[PDB]
């Protein structure tokens, strides 16, 4: 399965603000939904809880039926291995080429040398960075660095895709192309959860609309 379930999840940072309060929702496998909210609502915190980067202060979290509320540090790397994550700051390896950045998840999975070459180039083609493979991340524009993170998150055909403003940069023409890339992955059966501020992109689709406000979640059309 690839489902996600939240039951009264609440997260409070160490000595800081209360990021979330009583978040309760569940997502069927293969379902695509949008996450929205004002700046500082807690969209990135919600995505981090699912991936396991942060642990909730209350409530329980289920990933594919497994309880990941309190996971041992040994078991965490085998949870994030099934999740395609895109960050806000693009979290790149500045001392490695574009090819090395995209190929690292495959190496962790221990793929063969020939298969790495074919799959990496195919991923870079989907975002239009094929000729940038030999470059370093410092020699790329703001939108080009962002598209490297997207390519890295889709090489390993993950079960769940978590996107944190994947089109903050990039023009509207290129942003729609990136959205269509997630569409075809969803048709295969990948669960996609996207957080964004682009009103125009959302208005052109009809997916589930998860609205987050001051750490409180609204299910949209319904909590079902």
């Amino acid at each position: 399965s690839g489902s996600i379930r939240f039951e009264h999840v609440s997260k409070a940072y160490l000595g800081g603000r209360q990021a979330l309060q009583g978040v309760t929702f569940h997502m069927q496998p293969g379902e695509m939904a949008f996450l929205t909210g004002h700046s500082g609502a807690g969209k990135s915190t919600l995505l981090k809880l699912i991936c396991g980067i942060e642990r909730p202060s209350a409530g329980k979290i289920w990933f594919s039926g497994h309880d990941i509320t309190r996971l041992k540090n040994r078991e965490v790397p085998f949870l994030r291995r099934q999740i395609g994550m895109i960050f806000q700051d693009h979290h790149l390896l500045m001392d490695r080429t574009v090819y090395d950045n995209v190929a690292i998840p495959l190496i962790i999975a221990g793929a063969s040398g020939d298969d790495i070459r074919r799959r990496v180039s195919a991923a870079l083609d989907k975002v239009g960075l094929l000729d940038k493979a030999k470059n370093f991340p410092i020699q790329l524009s703001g939108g080009e660095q962002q598209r490297v993170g997207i390519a890295r998150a889709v090489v390993n055909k993950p079960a769940v895709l978590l996107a944190d403003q994947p089109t903050g940069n990039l023009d509207d023409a290129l942003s729609e192309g990136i959205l269509r890339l997630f569409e075809e992955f969803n048709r295969v059966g990948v669960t996609v959860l996207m957080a964004t501020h682009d009103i125009n992109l959302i208005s052109r689709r009809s997916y589930r609309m998860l609205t987050l406000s001051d750490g409180h979640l609204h299910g949209g059309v319904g909590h079902e």
């Binding site: 396991g52 980067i53 642990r55 540090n73 790397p77 949870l79 979290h91 001392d95 998840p105 962790i108």
Partner: protein
Amino acid sequence: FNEQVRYAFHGALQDLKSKPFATFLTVMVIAISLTLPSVCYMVYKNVNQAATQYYPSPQITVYLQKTLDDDAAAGVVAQLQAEQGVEKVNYLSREDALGEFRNWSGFGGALDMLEENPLPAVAVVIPKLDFQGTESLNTLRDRITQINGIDEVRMDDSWFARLAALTGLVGRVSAMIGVLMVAAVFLVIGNSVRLSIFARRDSINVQKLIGATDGFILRPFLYGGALLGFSGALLSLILSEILVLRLSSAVAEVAQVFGTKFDINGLSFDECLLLLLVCSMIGWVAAWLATVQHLRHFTPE
């Protein structure tokens, strides 16, 4: 080799190649801090050989009874050589003692006019190193006295005790100095590897976020620390050998003045391999301790 081992080694080697001058400075610092104890140890090894081989250590100087002749004195010498704490005994007759008496005085009027030789037979005893202790030499001189035909042990126990105190002081000081140089090697290698990783702690966080295990992350850093310790130790072996050649002329000159020929001995092949192997382990452990501290820092809870 394993495929991931090959990947880790290439990644570790690429970092050092990326910034040449900075890597060279780190290797140079380690090399100098390792040349210092290597040279001093080489001095200690060579000085110990010369002292054991060339120092005229105090002699027992056994005095025999004047009534005994050469044949009876030789029997006493044989009894001396049969003792547990005796390595070798050399015999000098009464006339031999008279010959040394003439050499020191330079005038024959103190020995020739006597009706008989007033000097007793002298036996030179070579004591064993383990039996050259304070209590052992004291015990040895008693057993020598108990041996028939011996009436005096000319050994003074004053110069022997005075020389013993200086040896104890030099060993005490060298031990404290040696600890500081060894302790400096651990800190210099440990701090250099610790600071090198800290500049790259961002790559540790990025790899951990995409699901890499701790073993996967550690290997490129572990091989980097071992290479740094190995490269620094290897360079010092070149420096130590060069400094021998600078001192080769000086030592030969001193040996020429004394007449006796002496040659300096450098580090053996076994010591060279041990130095490389130990320095690599220090870098390996330092890299393991530094990286594990970062992996715990990025843990959410």
